[PDB]
């Protein structure tokens, strides 16, 4: 009886909130973002009997990453030379070589342009792929750049070769990060192996669709995550563990040519072509792909107990979703993937190698916006890149009769990063509390 208030200081307890986060840079980074801030030595401490909940669909920093990536791109591109004077009437028929149909923008086109002195005009020419050209009304020999009817076009600075450098985040003073480590977690619900860290591990700002690549891999068996408010989900994420390797190549040898716009800025394009002409392609080990699809199918049925399962290729929309889109080196790609999803199922390593044929177009739009078409400078010579994949993005039609179906999508750039930050939830510590005791001043 007769207990009295004791006021402890700095007791461990937290509540949810949202706050800005520091972004760390690698110790040997590119060289505001190039070489700072510093790189720490991370550590992870495991705990006992810690009770906590997570929600991968609500957590904060997913939104923040969207701002950071766009801010970085804006900083990188802002000072580079605009291409506005280049946008003028093109005159082309372009059948000067035995290979004209596949590209149709050939050397020997012509468009009046300003020379290095401001009151004289000159005639030039260069290559273009028809996927970046459109035809004006009437005379079928006149052409215009696709995005110039609506926006200005900016050119990547030739000395800039930005690539996916990993980034990891550190909470500011007063906040703490919780991680969870149970290997069967669905992405929403309680955890029983809570943990705390100095900072998150590496994350790469990779841009792709129909599947995410160069990313990390799972720790256990394949997992499937989704929202659970209603079956009519937007995007279902499937996370792989077994890495299926992939290769892609571009055999032709591109020749770099240039023009100068005054006062002091140069413009690049594609000129002569060397070697025999072929379409770009990729390869896959059908063994591994079919085995992975088998496992996915036999895991996917858990939410759909008894219906048949069948895949079909994507449908409609701009090329950013009809195909697989990814970039290697300094140029982009688009790859039709009908063959890799025409399968089916029902209830109850180089053999058979598959190939797929792709295309490359220069002019690009940041997947979301209008008004900011990026222009890529062509890369001379041949290009090839090994790569591997770790997950797929699936959306579903209207389930009918005794069958259910999935198809590949994922055009919203948000989801990609949603697939690599399901772990962390950021909270704030409340270092003050109260309790009763019996101690006496004894003054």
């Amino acid at each position, epitope marked *: 009886e007769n207990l009295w208030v004791t006021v402890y200081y700095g007791v461990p307890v937290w509540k949810e909130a949202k706050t800005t986060l520091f972004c760390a840079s690698d110790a040997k980074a590119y060289e505001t973002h190039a070489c700072v801030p510093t790189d720490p030595n991370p550590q992870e401490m495991v705990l006992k009997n810690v009770t906590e909940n997570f929600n991968m*669909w609500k957590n904060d920093m997913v939104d923040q990453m969207h701002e950071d990536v766009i801010s970085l791109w804006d900083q990188s591109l802002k000072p580079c030379v605009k291409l506005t004077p280049l946008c003028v009437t093109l005159n082309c028929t372009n059948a000067t070589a035995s290979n004209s149909s596949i590209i149709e923008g050939m050397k020997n086109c012509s468009f009046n342009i300003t020379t290095e002195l401001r009151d004289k005009r000159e005639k030039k020419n260069a290559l273009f792929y028809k996927l970046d050209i459109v035809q004006l009304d009437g005379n079928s020999s006149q052409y215009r750049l696709i995005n110039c009817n*609506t926006s200005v076009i900016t050119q990547a600075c030739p000395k800039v070769s930005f690539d996916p450098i990993p980034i990891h985040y550190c909470a500011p003073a007063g906040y703490a990060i919780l991680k969870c480590n149970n290997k069967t977690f669905t992405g929403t619900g309680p955890c029983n192996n809570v943990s705390t860290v100095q900072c998150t591990h590496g994350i790469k700002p990779v841009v792709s669709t129909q599947l995410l690549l160069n990313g990390s891999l799972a720790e256990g068996e394949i997992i499937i995550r*989704s*929202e659970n*408010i*209603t*079956k*009519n*989900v*937007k*995007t279902i994420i499937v996370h792989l563990n077994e890495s299926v390797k992939i290769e892609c190549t571009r055999p032709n040898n591109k020749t770099r040519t240039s023009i100068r716009i005054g006062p002091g800025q140069w413009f690049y394009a594609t000129g002569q072509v060397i070697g025999d002409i072929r379409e770009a392609y990729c390869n896959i080990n059908e063994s591994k792909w079919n085995e992975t699809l088998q496992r996915v199918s036999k895991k996917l049925k858990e939410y759909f107990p008894h219906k048949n399962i069948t895949f079909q290729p994507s*449908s*409609g*929309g*701009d090329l*950013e*979703i009809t195909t697989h889109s990814f970039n290697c080196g300094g140029e982009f790609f688009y790859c039709n993937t009908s063959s890799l999803f025409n399968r089916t199922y029902m209830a109850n390593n180089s053999t058979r190698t598959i190939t797929i044929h792709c295309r490359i177009k220069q002019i690009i739009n940041m*997947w*979301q916006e*209008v008004g900011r078409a990026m222009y890529a400078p062509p890369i001379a010579g041949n290009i090839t890149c090994i790569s591997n994949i770790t997950g797929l993005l699936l*959306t579903r*039609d*209207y*389930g*009918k009769n005794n069958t259910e179906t999935f198809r590949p*999508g994922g*055009g*919203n750039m*948000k989801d990609n990063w*949603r697939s690599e930050l399901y772990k962390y939830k950021v909270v704030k510590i409340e270092p003050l509390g109260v309790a009763p005791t019996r101690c006496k001043r004894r003054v």
Partner: antibody
Amino acid sequence: QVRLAQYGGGVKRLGATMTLSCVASGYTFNDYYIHWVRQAPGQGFELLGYIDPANGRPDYAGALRERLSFYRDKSMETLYMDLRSLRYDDTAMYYCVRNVGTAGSLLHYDHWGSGSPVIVSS
Amino acid sequence: EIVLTQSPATLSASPGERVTLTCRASRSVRNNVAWYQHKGGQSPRLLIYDASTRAAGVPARFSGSASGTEFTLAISNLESEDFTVYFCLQYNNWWTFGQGTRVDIKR
């Protein structure tokens, strides 16, 4: 404050292709879906399919995947619907509707539009 | 798949009365339901979504609740301009609609 207005429609001849259209207003064009719903006279509604403006994905109803068509342009905030081989039984009203949505689920319809009829006769 | 059975096809009332609508479902759809307003040659509008929460600009006399496999809508104090057709809607599996019930003059 936000509106969805329609143009086109009117009478059409049997067995002919037909068009409709909806024009967005300044709320935001990239942050919401769009649906097309119709109503035969003296009948319960039904749904056709939903088109996202962001990338252009369609997803048709199960009963009409051979005959419908969607596409959009973000530049002028416009959406076009193509319907082919009008049967006699398609005579009805058509609406556009916005559709609130979170990052991972779809909920309901909250702002219907102008309403446009179509009549088929030889 | 999902079907909503709307009954009765008509309700009779007079101004100042309290009228209750009802909507039945083929199978459970959680709390995912909403009620809509529709008038002669006009643009329908939102009344209630999530079966409990009212939206902005709505009159304060609307109310309703869920019943597991049934849904209830009620007008606390009927006004003259409230005489119209209403229909229930669900959004759990794939979109569908009811047939529509009309308010009627009591006699």
